[PDB]
């Protein structure tokens, strides 16, 4: 009865927002002449691309169900109910066309910035339960339709809003600035260390045409505050000094999709489980903590640590076995904590890794090889599936300018929601 799950293929759209030449604003050659994609268009592009790149064009009816991850569509796009949006995504814009997805099951799932990861878990339950053999998991978000401050208030839906919205209009930046204060007070790592994380993300993004910040070049020195425009922007005076612009992930639009199959699903598609286009999901785990209460030790992401430890234990591997990882760098501060949650650094030693370059493209454990949430960008619902697909892409040699020289055999993802209140971690094995 031991039922395995395979990534058959997937798709990542360019991630776009302010600072990307692909984002249309008063300044783009096409301003007034063309528009940025709507949520519906990103979803359509993501579903279509996922089917295309997974060998399902012309046989989309063998997909059993679709799970959508999305956090804030109801706010930014006035649109919930993305299940039936997904069902209409294959033929979006062609009135009355034949539609092989009609009447299949579909839903949206949500857990803040972990929504993409949750969509993958839900898809996997289906594949393991008798009810599906092939599933589509897609994550989409549009956040460019509101100002930075309105956006902050929207993202604050991930916080304990009643308790924490008062911190700052930029509620999440402030919650992480609050960690960094405590982190500095305990000498856990420094603001130079977090600058070094950004330097790496932006260098990696410069090699990735899909990255929101692909065209932006930043030195360590700029990331460390030697740039007048790298402002300490928070309003809350208690935490203001601990966060720079470059410490923050992007407000982005984008989508990512993956096709997941069990062994019967592979058979229906004419594939063997040893097919070299495949990657096996050896394990996936989810851990969720208490929205209403925060641990004292701001130097440890306990929930993320639990999810990663569960996933690694289920896959029967240790962190030192990992060859590549994607982690939830919603801030530079978060990336450092993620190294310790994943277990690739001991508590208090993420700083060793970032000072030695161990997580750069040339290091022994490259992390966020295409730019992370910092430079690739952070369309919240897409992020969890983008993580999975970036491990997949490295494993199949598809990353071009940021391709790892040594093709990774084992990889991990670690996707987080809110201030370490939801976490989803997967262990992937190259086939």
> Per the annotation, where are the binding residues for acetyl-CoA?
18, 149, 249, 328, 378
Do 37 and 45 form a contact (C-beta atoms < 8 A)?
Answer: yes
CA distance 163 to 422: 18
CB 139, min distance to its own copies, A: 13
Structure tokens at 60: 């989309």
| Contact between 158 and 417 (Cβ < 8 Å) | yes
Q: Which stretch binds its own copies (CB under 8 A): 8-16, 81-89, 327-335, 385-393?
A: 81-89
Identity of the residue, 21 or 80, whose beta carbon is nearer to its own copies in the bound complex: 80
Please give the residues from 294 up to 313 whose contact with its own copies meets the rule CB under 8 A. Answer: 303, 306
Stretch that binds its own copies, among 49-57, 158-166, 240-248, 344-352 (CB under 8 A): 158-166
Applying the rule CB under 8 A, the residues between 4 and 63 that interact with its own copies are 38, 40
Burial 368-403 (b: 16+ CB within 10 A, else e): bbbbbbbbbbbbbbbbbbbbbbbbbbbbbeebeebb
Shortest distance, position 61 Cβ to its own copies, whole Å? 14
**Binds its own copies by CB under 8 A, chosen from 422, 425, 429, 430:** 422
Q: Nearest-CA neighbor of 154 among 92, 96, 220, 76?
A: 76
Using CB under 8 A as the binding rule, whether residue 147 contacts its own copies is answered as no
110, with CB counted inside 10 A (0-12, 13-18, 19+), is buried
Q: What's the rounded Cα separation, in Å, for the pair 286 and 263?
A: 23
- Alpha-carbon distance 377 to 244, whole Å? 17
Among residues 21, 35, 80, 346, which is the contact residue for its own copies, using CB under 8 A? Answer: 80
Sole residue written with tokens 């260098």? 203
The reply to whether 85 sits near its own copies by the rule CB under 8 A is yes
265 near 3, Cβ under 8 Å?
Answer: no
Instruction: Give the integer Cα–Cα distance in Å for 197 and 191.
Output: 10
Tell me: does residue 78 bind its own copies (CB under 8 A): yes
| Residue 112 in contact with its own copies, rule: CB under 8 A | yes
Please check whether residue 45 is in contact with residue 255, taking contact to mean a CB–CB distance below 8 angstroms. yes
> Are 421 and 288 within 8 A, CB to CB?
yes
Interacting residue with its own copies among 16, 42, 63, 72 (CB under 8 A): 72
Element (H, E) at 11: strand 5-12
Q: Does 220 bind its own copies (CB under 8 A)?
A: no
Which 8-state DSSP code applies to residue 36?
P
Residue 130 found at the interface with its own copies (CB under 8 A): yes
* Binding to its own copies, residues 343-382 (CB under 8 A): none
Asked if 421 touches its own copies (CB under 8 A), the answer is: yes
Q: One symbol per residue from 228 to 267: x for binding its own copies (CB under 8 A), - otherwise; what is it?
A: ----------------------------------------
User: How many residues sit close enough to its own copies to count as binding (CB under 8 A)?
Assistant: 71
Supply angle C-alpha 368, 160, 302, rounded to 5: 45
Asked if 354 and 309 count as a contact pair (C-beta separation under 8 A), the reply is no
Q: Does 341 bind its own copies (CB under 8 A)?
A: no
User: 395 vs 423, which CB is nearer to its own copies?
Assistant: 423
| CA atoms within 13 A of residue 69's CA, in its CB half-sphere | 32
Instruction: Tell me how far, at minimum, the Cβ of 148 lies from its own copies, in Å.
Output: 18
What Rg do the C-alpha atoms of the chain give, in angstroms? 20
Binding status of residue 342 toward its own copies by CB under 8 A: no
Task: Out of 417, 426, 429, 430, name the contact with its own copies by CB under 8 A.
Answer: 417
Binding residues: 18, 149, 249, 328, 378
**92, 182, 220, 233: which one binds its own copies (CB under 8 A):** 92
> Which of these ranges, 8-16, 96-104, 205-213, 382-390, lies near its own copies under the rule CB under 8 A?
96-104
Nearer to its own copies, 213 or 385 (CB): 385
Binding mask 269-288 for its own copies (x = CB under 8 A): ----------------xxxx
Of the listed pieces 160-168, 187-195, 335-343, 355-363, which binds its own copies according to CB under 8 A?
160-168
Nearest distance from residue 152's CB to its own copies, in Å? Answer: 12
Q: Does 291 bind its own copies (CB under 8 A)?
A: yes
CA dihedral 277→385→403→279, nearest 10 degrees, is -30
């Amino acid at each position: 009865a031991a039922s395995r799950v395979f990534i058959v293929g997937g798709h990542i759209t360019p991630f776009v927002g302010k600072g990307s030449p692909l984002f249309i604003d008063k300044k783009h050659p096409d301003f007034g002449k063309k528009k940025n994609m709507t949520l519906e268009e990103i979803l359509a592009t993501t579903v279509q691309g996922t089917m295309e790149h997974s060998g399902l064009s012309g046989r989309e009816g063998i997909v059993d169900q679709v799970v959508v991850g999305n956090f804030l569509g109801e706010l930014f796009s006035s649109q919930g109910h993305l299940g039936p949006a997904a069902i209409g995504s294959l033929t979006y814009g062609q009135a009355g066309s034949k539609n092989p997805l009609m009447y299949k099951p579909a839903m949206r799932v949500e857990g803040a910035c972990a929504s993409g990861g949750l969509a993958v878990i839900s898809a996997m339950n289906a594949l393991k339960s008798g009810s599906a053999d092939i599933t589509l998991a897609v994550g989409v978000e549009v956040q460019t339709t509101a100002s930075a401050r309105v956006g902050g208030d929207y993202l604050a839906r991930a916080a304990d809003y009643q308790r924490q919205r008062q911190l700052d209009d930029f509620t999440f930046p402030c919650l992480f600035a609050k960690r960094m204060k405590y982190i500095a007070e305990h000498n856990h790592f420094t603001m130079e260390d977090t600058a070094r994380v950004a330097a790496k993300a932006y260098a990696n993004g410069n090699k990735n045409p899909l990255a929101h910040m692909h065209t932006r070049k930043l030195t360590f020195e700029q990331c460390n505050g030697e740039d007048p425009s790298n402002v300490k922007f928070l309003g809350n005076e208690t935490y203001k000094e601990y966060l720079r612009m470059t410490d923050c992930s992007q407000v982005s639009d984008g989508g990512a999709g993956v096709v997941l199959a069990n062994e019967e699903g592979l058979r229906k598609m004419g594939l063997s489980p040893n097919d070299s286009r495949l990657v096996e999901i050896k394990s996936i785990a989810c851990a969720v903590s208490n929205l209403y209460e925060d641990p004292d030790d701001a130097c440890c992401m306990f929930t993320s640590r639990q999810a990663a430890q569960k996933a690694l234990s289920m896959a029967n591997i240790k962190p030192s076995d990992l060859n590549v990882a994607e982690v939830h760098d919603c801030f530079t501060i978060a990336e450092m904590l993620m190294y310790e949650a994943l277990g690739i650094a001991e508590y208090g030693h993420a700083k060793d890794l970032i000072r030695n370059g161990d997580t750069t493209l040339e290091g022994r454990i490259p992390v966020n090889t295409g730019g992370g949430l910092l430079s690739f960008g952070h369309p919240v619902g897409a992020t969890g599936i983008k993580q999975i697909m970036e491990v997949y892409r490295q494993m199949k040699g598809q990353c071009e300018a940021y391709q790892m020289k040594k093709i990774p055999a084992l990889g991990a993802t670690l996707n987080m929601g809110g201030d370490d209140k939801t976490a989803v971690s997967a262990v992937l094995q190259n086939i």
